[PDB]
Amino acid sequence: FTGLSKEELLKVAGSPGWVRTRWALLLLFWLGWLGMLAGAVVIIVRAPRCRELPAQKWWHTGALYRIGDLQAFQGHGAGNLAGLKGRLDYLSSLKVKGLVLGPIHKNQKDDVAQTDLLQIDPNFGSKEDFDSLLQSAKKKSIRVILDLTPNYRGENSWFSTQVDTVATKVKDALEFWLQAGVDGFQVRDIENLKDASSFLAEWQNITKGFSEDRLLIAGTNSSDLQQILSLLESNKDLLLTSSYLSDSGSTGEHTKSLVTQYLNATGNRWCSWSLSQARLLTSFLPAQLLRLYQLMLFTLPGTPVFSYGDEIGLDAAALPGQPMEAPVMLWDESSFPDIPGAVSANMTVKGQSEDPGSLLSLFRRLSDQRSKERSLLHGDFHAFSAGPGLFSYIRHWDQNERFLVVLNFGDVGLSAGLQASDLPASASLPAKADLLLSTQPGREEGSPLELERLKLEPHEGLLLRFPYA
Amino acid sequence: ALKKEIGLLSACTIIIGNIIGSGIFISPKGVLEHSGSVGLALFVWVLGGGVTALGSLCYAELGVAIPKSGGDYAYVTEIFGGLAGFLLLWSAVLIMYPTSLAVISMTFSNYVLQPVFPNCIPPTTASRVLSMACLMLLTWVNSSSVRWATRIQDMFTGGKLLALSLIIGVGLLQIFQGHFEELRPSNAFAFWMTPSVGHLALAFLQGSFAFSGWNFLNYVTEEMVDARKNLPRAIFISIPLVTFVYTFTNIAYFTAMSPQELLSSNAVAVTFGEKLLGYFSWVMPVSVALSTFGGINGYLFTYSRLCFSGAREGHLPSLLAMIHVRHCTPIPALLVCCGATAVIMLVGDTYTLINYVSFINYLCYGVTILGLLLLRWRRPALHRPIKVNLLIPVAYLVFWAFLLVFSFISEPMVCGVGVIIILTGVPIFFLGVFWRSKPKCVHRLTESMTHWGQELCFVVYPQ
Ligand SMILES: *[C@@H]1O[C@H](CO)[C@@H](O[C@@H]2O[C@H](CO)[C@@H](O)[C@H](O)[C@H]2NC(C)=O)[C@H](O)[C@H]1NC(C)=O
Ligand SMILES: *[C@@H]1O[C@H](CO)[C@@H](O)[C@H](O)[C@H]1NC(C)=O
Ligand SMILES: *[C@@H]1O[C@H](CO)[C@@H](O)[C@H](O)[C@H]1NC(C)=O
Ligand SMILES: *[C@@H]1O[C@H](CO)[C@@H](O)[C@H](O)[C@H]1NC(C)=O
Structure with missing residues (x-):
């Protein structure tokens, strides 16, 4: 109809010049598919392994x-x-x-x-x-x-x-x-x-x-x-x-x-x-x-x-x-x-x-x-320096959702004063982190709060949560 | 003529392979989330089957009434005119099919690397490369022949049946082992509810995604031997088996463990396999990949026959609808479908796009039901060897209206964006078909491109 006919195609596509190109193109596709399959195996092999669970008992999993x-x-x-x-x-x-x-x-x-x-x-x-x-x-x-x-x-x-x-x-x-x-x-x-x-x-x-x-x-x-x-x-x-x-x-x-x-x-x-x-x-x-x-x-x-x-x-x-x-x-x-x-x-x-x-x-x-969460169940615990009367630490198991807890036992409000260069590079604290809950009601949840200028209130604890980084 | 060799068994296997895909291994968590209870979650799985059966009866009657190929699109084109048919074709080619293919392939890749990293997620690049590799292999085997595609579909349907039977038996053995503390009428409704709105809309709209593809056998017609008898028989046989398999599979999924463990685990099948088998549990996930490999083919076999029948009538560029002498297969159509599936892959997290496809394949199911209802009165002289009693289109229509209204209120932004996307095809229609007698620069370029693709792919135009 709109295109050519069978007879015209056979007269023009049976000659050398087209049978070679389609065979060359067929070879190129087959080479590419194997090249992609080989490339995937290279990426899979050159990838970090996943850490193994420690076979927890029945009293490790709760209070x-x-x-x-x-x-x-x-x-x-x-x-x-x-x-x-x-x-x-x-x-x-x-x-x-x-x-x-x-x-x-x-x-x-x-x-x-x-x-x-x-x-x-x-x-x-x-x-x-x-x-x-x-x-x-x-x-x-x-x-x-x-x-x-x-x-x-x-x-x-x-x-x-x-x-x-x-x-x-x-x-x-x-x-x-x-x-x-x-x-x-x-x-x-x-x-x-x-x-x-x-x-x-x-x-x-x-x-x-x-x-x-x-x-x-x-x-x-x-x-x-x-x-x-x-x-x-x-x-x-x-x-x-x-x-x-x-x-x-x-x-x-x-x-x-x-x-x-x-x-x-x-x-x-x-x-x-x-x-x-x-x-x-x-x-x-x-x-x-x-x-x-x-x-x-x-x-x-x-x-x-x-x-x-x-x-x-x-x-x-x-x-x-x-x-x-x-x-x-x-x-x-x-x-x-x-x-x-x-x-x-x-x-x-x-x-x-x-x-x-x-x-x-x-x-x-x-x-x-x-x-x-796996981090709370069997995750590593690391504490870093903070301001006066401030107790802060991070829980992280292998790659799961990292947790950040900050506690202020003082009777006066002050800044968190969080600092870097004291944690393993696997779970370094980022610029901003989500908030899960706070001891004193009045704050919002789910919003990514900044940690550089974070402020604290007397007798208050925060339970933040930031992702793998 | 393309061919006439698809028997009853081949069509039945096509329907099973299209229905049984990645839905059964992904949906049961989500349906347990919004429902909140095991009983209410099972209610969705047992009622979606009935709704699908009603739709299947209506489609069987409509497809024996109108023998034209390209079902779901020829009917609308004939009844509501060219515009509605073109809109349906545009939505099906651009929204429904490539998204489903991308989801199926990504599920295959993610579940085939489960033993390698069974505590975390695999690297994204490896998953994308594996999915593209299987897509390219399957599109090549589809362009190579049709008998091979049918045989592959039959073997993979047998494989999915065997894997699902093994899962059903493993889940059932707990009736003799006495592990039916769940589904016990004592606990039964382990939870009541939490919201006070129609949250069941996006529980039906997410559980009726493993049921997608029951109408695809209508697309592969003019390739079916004795369509007047084999098509209704296949439609009537396939659906009850699918419903019985799915309900019992969900029963086994909730019987072996607790709802919370589905609510946390991202490997719903893998947890069941590793708990009820311990060692040698590597058999089930590979089968799942095997299972998923039976889906992509079942899509590319029918998708290529849609975009084919959508180009004969001028709604698509003439470069498609190509027939290749020496094992007729729509080669450029298959290449177009594979490429369209691939372009979606550059955007991830399409598991949030299940709502997209599940909304669109409710809109263009209610539209076809409405077309059937209109044709029932407007043209009562048609020969209908198989007829359906009335009130089935009415029931499907009221359910359809309810689901649309209650799903357009929960999350309006994505549904509205999708509606705008399907509606902006009208200018394309006007520029393509409605506008004629173009300058010579258009016809000459179109003919040159068509001839170049013709010489490259070695085809003939049926016309
Ligand atoms: C902890 O328990 C020990 C043992 O009961 C207490 O030690 C007692 O201290 C008193 C005070 O001198 C002695 O009279 C007792 O003889 C000690 N007990 C024993 C068994 O020798 C200790 O005082 C307790 N500490 C606290 C803070 O309660
Ligand atoms: C602990 O039990 C083992 C097992 O018989 C025994 O050999 C060992 O002597 C026991 N040790 C003590 C301190 O009772
Ligand atoms: C615990 O004590 C050992 C022994 O003095 C010391 O080397 C180590 O640094 C201590 N732990 C911490 C966290 O300082
Ligand atoms: C808690 O109980 C104390 C005891 O009288 C009362 O003064 C206080 O108002 C109560 N708090 C709330 C929030 O009801």
Whole structure:
């Protein structure tokens, strides 16, 4: 039609001059395709490899939730394991990865003759109530860690008698409890146990013998670094919770010195961050620093350990007539019969789950971030110099979303004063970075903020986030 | 004549290969994002199949009514005139097809390098080069012959069927293994909702992308033996199998793990394979690449037959619609499609362009349904050996209207830009066809270029 015809083409395209060009062009295409395929393999080979995951355990992936007094956790009505069964929904909402149950064995007094570890107190339920909790917890991916300290109703944690009988009954206790199905153990106040290093080695030996995913935690009241490192010379997978981070915090420089000097001393092993073995944060900090500290413990390289009520800022100093060793959790304003009417709208769990400005909302947002990003889970931690009273550090694993946390512990506002030439070139801070959340509400989120002229407010923490560069 | 050798099995394999592509390995995350719940996400996958079946019935009736080639475009051209037909051809050639081809090729390249870097993303240049290499190989094998293309399509359809059957069996084995804690009516609706608007618009518009391409068999006609019987049979057979495969594949995707793990992982298939097989899990991702390699061909086989039939009627430059003596294949048409797919590749992140193609292949599906409805009344004397009961075009029309209105409110900027892009082809129409008796400088140049391409590619013009 518009073009030439078949006969005209055959007369003009059958002669030499066209059959050569199309054959030459066909060869050129085939050479190019192989040239592209060879070029791709060159680029693939001359490319950096991707780093390998470190095969995390079940306690590397989130915080732990210590509960001391099961009776006071619910208050009245329910005071056994069956009472806790209905409250696992709240803990699952908190995105915790473990439960350090309080002692449950029948302990009467300092008499060791009838103090045994292999049966549960009648007030806490029985075996069928205990075991039903474990599998129900598994259905929610919640691990249960059983505490066992032979003397908790008295002033001495391990009696004033010898240590032979308590050790052998504790050894028999584990053999029973691993068969029961518990996912770990905890012992508190080991400084009252003679030569605790040897027994801890045996307990770690036996517990890890049953399985590789088991845990053992030890608690101490000492804050001296040399004393703390004394127990870790013979154990490598030991979680030690102590008062090292406590007894200070009025200045950010002291915390920076405490954290940095601890990590290089232990060689950047896996550690646990907690202000005390069995007491809340409010016993060591003013009411204005709970938001800042909960930001620090959820980004430091370890396994944060919290007591019950620390997500709502529960404090016994704001309510008269509350024992320091067993405060009652405030489900609502009717949970404390004594001096009624003093409980406000922000001192209840239900009074903070709908306000995106309360501690519980901040706890849940931080908890989700910790158990989601690879940088927070198993990323390297590097801290750099900053202004006076400023603590700043960066988390970065291989190439994932880098995080930047800046904390100002001072009571006066100042500039961040961030500087370069002190970080590895893999994750050098860029000119601008996104902001995820801030301790003090009032700022925007998602906008790329500048770091050269960044300003800070008293008792404020920032959680920035910048991409691979 | 081009050829008449495509049997029932070949047409059925064409439909399956066009439907089963990169959608099933990419969509299930997104449909689980906006829906929020497993049940509501499965609702989209089970209702899109019904909507596609209704459209397929309507298209089968319309295609047996009008035997002209180039379906979806001949019907509109005949009914609404030249202008609507040219607009549909312009949108299909420039928007629907190259974007789908680019997405399919990029998915192939990204999933074929998964074992090499199974903790991060591969370099972009290597992915682009691999995708261009497979595009060039497939366009060459399409320009070489048609029997080879059909055989390749059949083998790759068998391969996709085998891979999907293996996935369905692995997911099913948990009924005997007792791992059905998900989809348990106890948990069932694990989540309720979060917004208070029509966010389901961009969940249907993103889940009905694995269903794209069910109308493409109508493009390859005048190459089908006994089109009056084989085409409706293939259309009626293909869709139920696709729906049954897709629903159960989604069931297996949500049964082996938690919704969050789809909401974080970018390798939806790879996570399933590595969890339910552990070692020897390298088999499934390669098959996925194999699966995706069955899509590109199924596109280039039909795309070339569209731009062919779109140039005989003068809506496209005369240099196309070329027939090559010694194994007739539309060589310059195939080169044009390959190049058009390649130019898109210079712009990345076309996974955000799924909304583009999914909007456009709703507009030019409602338009054809409206054309069928108009022709049902205006010309009732046509011979229709296979007839569809009414109310199917009406139901598809009301659903179409609802999806358009609710998808034009959520994100208006990109949809408006796309509408402007498809509408600015009218000046091209006026300059090309409506304007005639041009100066000799136009005809002489056009004839010289056509003759040069003719001598280069060794073709003949059917006319
Ligand atoms: C940490 O615990 C140790 C051990 O209980 C405490 O050491 C006691 O110190 C008092 C004060 O001189 C002595 O009377 C006791 O005899 C010590 N205990 C033992 C077992 O010898 C130490 O005071 C505690 N530190 C803090 C800050 O509470
Ligand atoms: C630890 O257990 C192993 C396994 O039997 C044993 O050989 C070793 O002596 C144990 N060490 C201690 C300190 O109990
Ligand atoms: C930790 O202590 C060692 C030993 O003195 C020292 O070389 C190292 O620099 C310290 N770590 C840091 C971060 O300074
Ligand atoms: C929190 O409770 C205290 C206690 O009375 C009250 O003074 C304060 O206004 C409350 N804050 C908000 C935001 O309701």
